[PDB]
């Protein structure tokens, strides 16, 4: 069982310490700001469940940039808008299940600093193409991870596989991944949960609208620079 | 019992690779255009202008290196030929966004606080060591986010990742014939601590400001086909036939 | 190579000792 | 003073040298090293992470269909499904891998490989495969009786949905070169083939076109030397806005 | 003799180097060090001394009226008096300060600030202010209810005629850059605003137009690095009698 | 836990900044004017000709440094172009008010007691160390008072603050074409003990002999307005708008 | 940097030790 | 060999320097120091005479 | 609120602990179902997937 | 200055030690 | 000759010691 705060997920499991690191608070020797950062423990360190996305046949992929998925949800989103800095890990739990007759594979992969690229133009992606919010995004070209890199080498990143034969869940436990100890949440996204149909959904049974539900629990949230909300 | 010391990231990335190259004219610039280099050039020091060092440094998300800038100046003549001059060059290091000079003989080249280096062509190349100057603890090679607090900022360009400006001029005055002075800058990153390895970029680069992609028209390194095609999955291309 | 006659610690050679 | 004399090799800028050079900014205090996760001290740590093979590098396999291999229920006996060109250094299904993109920065390589084949059928899909590794010298084996004489592993789609096909390091030399000759003794690696051990047997409600995802990693004995530039990238002109770094 | 070879970087005059050079006057006996008061071993000692802010950097504030801020008796409730652009590196009320003129010799800076607001009304003048420090990200707060959510201090004109508004060091990065982009995350500092906590209340014989002098210093944790030339000075020609130094 | 070692005054002021620059002709001076440099120039060594090192050294009242004079000589040609010559230069250090030479080939350049330095153009630049030569224990950077006992003395100019004369000539004779030989002198103060810090100068300089001020016509750095103006005291210029 | 092969004490490098 | 680099101030003939230089006549035996009266080790000894 | 996410995999049952969250020590009965002393909360159930 | 790599004792630097 | 100021062991002089 993954019980964070008042949230819980009864699991049956195989998680992923991303880069071997567990989310912890900022140590006082690596601390930078002179004031003590607030730590809203049970109010933010809990499973924030996003919308479910329809895992279809002609699906390309889905990406949620963090904490851009969570800047407007619950007491994490209220702490984000009221504090200039933050430092949070993440415990992404991705729920996707089907019958024992469905086939399919998910590369649930969490990408640190997913600088996207637009296709067939020299113009950089704008604000509206990157900061999609809680709705997330959709890969235009998942085979190259929308930045000219390769999907084949995307397993160098913290990843878990939802093979609908074997397992029905992916748990990636992300630490604070930034060059800076804290950062401004409304203009930067350290991680990016990329969920990608490497093997598409296929079956011969009656068609069910199979979704992929995403529960993202922030972990060890610090916040600093308290002011009015935006 | 094989040594693995050549694949060290301190050995992998510390190749003094070409990062800048301008053949700029050296003549009477009293009648030249405004875009042309009037015996000086600024260069915002980035790792991205040349795709071979860029793809090596884009293997990682965060890099902490000390740029060892080596400036190779070489000279050619633009009817008759005469001897090549021993030109003295200044390469003043200006920080990111600070005042870069607008002339050759402007009073910004006095270097009252900026780091300059006065070198000649016939000397060995000017090798300086620019330190790790990021305000963060590593260079965000890929920066998912925006710099400004408003919504007009450039995506991917963190100014903390930006090294600075390398304003290079020729200290000599104009001479009665025109020379073409090509300045090649070779940055060797050193004392390298590399974090979070990434997929190597397969598609060719489009711009230095971002990670846009187009791919080749056909395989290999195309968008729909990175690896070059073969006949079937059961067809061996380089099969031995005896 | 142990030659570093500069007063700055970053000015040394590439620390390829691993 | 000190009587010196310049050796040959004086004043030459060798790019791969190792020398202390003049600091531009004196008494500079760098930013303190904050602990960032996932430090790579050695590029073989990047190589040993398994990454997908593009075994389906065919025409009419557009984009993401190249990673998976569609195996089906076969009415014949002991048929060939796929074979893998094992040249790490050369172009082929191993080029766009972590073991392959990093090794194309090098010329000579050692050590074993590690193929993981992940089956992506239904839970009701049962069957068996055989993953023959054929050391080189001969042709790519096409019938099953020819290739099981090599280094094979027989794999069930029962509780096992993955494998570890250790391609052993079998070479006369210590290392293996890169050339434009793919058929050299110093360059050729061998052949991994895959055959129906039994069949792919699915019920009426499972999709028959089941897919295999093939990984490849390295082992702890893997090694790379004689560094060279990557042929996987290359520019013919300056990039866009490369003038804007000057202007 | 000694076999040497010239490295790249030989014969280049780097201006910020550190090398022993040939003395022009040999066996020179310099003048003995007489103890002169007020030695500065470190430029942060110059920075930590508090110096006046030009908050009244408006038109029709000619000369010395720019240092003081004329606050008055306000018939409304909770009004805005002044706000301070906090960019130390950029142009604004902090440029002509000891914390600002020395920091424009640098690019990256750290540490807290220390605003002292000295009230220069009569002794009979009584009132209260609130000195809100707003960390950046949002707009400059205009109403009092918006800005007291930040780091404020509430200050009486009773026995207290001065304050110490510690602007805390709140930044994600270790340092803060200078650019021509004042709205960057790496460049923007925040906003100090000042509101009538209550009012300025004076009797019939005290002048209602009371003035605030605002200081700014640094703290002990202040730091500066990556030295650059000052944009606060610059010449387009030679100065007067600069030829007379030659003639 | 941040290092404060870059703001040291020994690091702050020890930038080798440009203090002198003359492009003087190098030709047959049999028909030139009296004011023009006939293959030599004297320079009374002052920190004040270039405003970037001057404002740094005018941050303090009293400075005790060792001037490390680096002399960068660079050469250009005044119809046809030929090769640049390898000219030998003498830079004889004359004290304050002593006999400076009146010719190129005068018998004051024999340097029977003066410190000279004979350097070439193709060499590395001539770097000498002129010591702390003030008769007082520090250089009065600002000298409130007068030098002479009579009332005609110059205000602010203490001759004890004056370093000396840097008489620089070209040792070669005249050649049948005219060259323009620009001599740039770079003084790096070192072993610096700095006393009594001062307000940094905001208004632009007028003369090197004094501290006169005019200011710009408008803000910034004007007389009535040093800091650039804004709308009101309650108007934020660089305000975030979202 | 400890290299001072001159007989004069002022001829040394910039004493940046603090 | 020994990796060197020329500083600024290389190849300049400063007249008041102090450097060991190449002897023209090797294994030269100078004339032995005979005690001559009135040696001046310091020019202030010349100055202090009225 | 206080949720639990439950699979129909090996798990065919749960234990949704409704926690005791009340200001008072106890909770009354009235004919007012919307009182602070009487109302308990709301258990809802959604399709997770 | 103690640098005298010549075999002759007169070839040293100027003995300014007093 | 014992002068090898490089970090590589093959970069030394010709090992003519026998």
From TrEMBL, chain A:
Going by the entry's taxonomy, the superkingdom of the source organism is recorded as Viruses
Q: Where in the cell is it found?
A: Host cytoplasmic vesicle membrane; Host nucleus; Virion
Describe its assembly: Interacts with protein 3CD. Homohexamer; forms a hexameric ring structure with 6-fold symmetry characteristic of AAA+ ATPases. Interacts (via N-terminus) with host RTN3 (via reticulon domain); this interaction is important for viral replication. Interacts with capsid protein VP3; this interaction may be important for virion morphogenesis.
| Function statement | Acts as a primer for viral RNA replication and remains covalently bound to viral genomic RNA. VPg is uridylylated prior to priming replication into VPg-pUpU. The oriI viral genomic sequence may act as a template for this. The VPg-pUpU is then used as primer on the genomic RNA poly(A) by the RNA-dependent RNA polymerase to replicate the viral genome. During genome replication, the VPg-RNA linkage is removed by the host TDP2, thereby accelerating replication.
Record-stated family: Belongs to the picornaviruses polyprotein family.
Protein's name in the database:
Genome polyprotein
Phylogenetic classification of the source organism: Viruses, Riboviria, Orthornavirae, Pisuviricota, Pisoniviricetes
UniProtKB/TrEMBL annotation, chains C, G, J, K:
Q: Which domain of life is it from?
A: Viruses
Which compartment or compartments is the protein found in? Host cytoplasmic vesicle membrane; Host nucleus; Virion
Subunit comment for this entry?
Answer: Homodimer. Interacts with host GBF1. Interacts (via GOLD domain) with host ACBD3 (via GOLD domain); this interaction allows the formation of a viral protein 3A/ACBD3 heterotetramer with a 2:2 stoichiometry, which will stimulate the recruitment of host PI4KB in order to synthesize PI4P at the viral RNA replication sites. Interacts with capsid protein VP1 and capsid protein VP3 to form heterotrimeric protomers.
What does this chain do?
Capsid protein VP3: Forms an icosahedral capsid of pseudo T=3 symmetry with capsid proteins VP2 and VP3. The capsid is 300 Angstroms in diameter, composed of 60 copies of each capsid protein and enclosing the viral positive strand RNA genome.
Per the record, the similarity remark reads: Belongs to the picornaviruses polyprotein family.
The entry's protein name is Genome polyprotein
- Source species, please? Human enterovirus D68 (EV68)
Q: Which residues of the full protein are shown?
A: 28 to 45 of 2188
Automatic annotation (TrEMBL), chain H:
Localization per Swiss-Prot or TrEMBL: Host cytoplasmic vesicle membrane; Host nucleus; Virion
- What this chain does, per the record? Protein 3CD: Involved in the viral replication complex and viral polypeptide maturation. It exhibits protease activity with a specificity and catalytic efficiency that is different from protease 3C. Protein 3CD lacks polymerase activity. Protein 3CD binds to the 5'UTR of the viral genome.
Protein family per UniProt = Belongs to the picornaviruses polyprotein family.
Q: How does it assemble?
A: Interacts with capsid protein VP1 and capsid protein VP3 in the mature capsid.
Report what the protein is called.
Genome polyprotein
Recite the lineage of the species.
Viruses, Riboviria, Orthornavirae, Pisuviricota, Pisoniviricetes
Positions spanned in the full protein: 318 to 367 of 2188
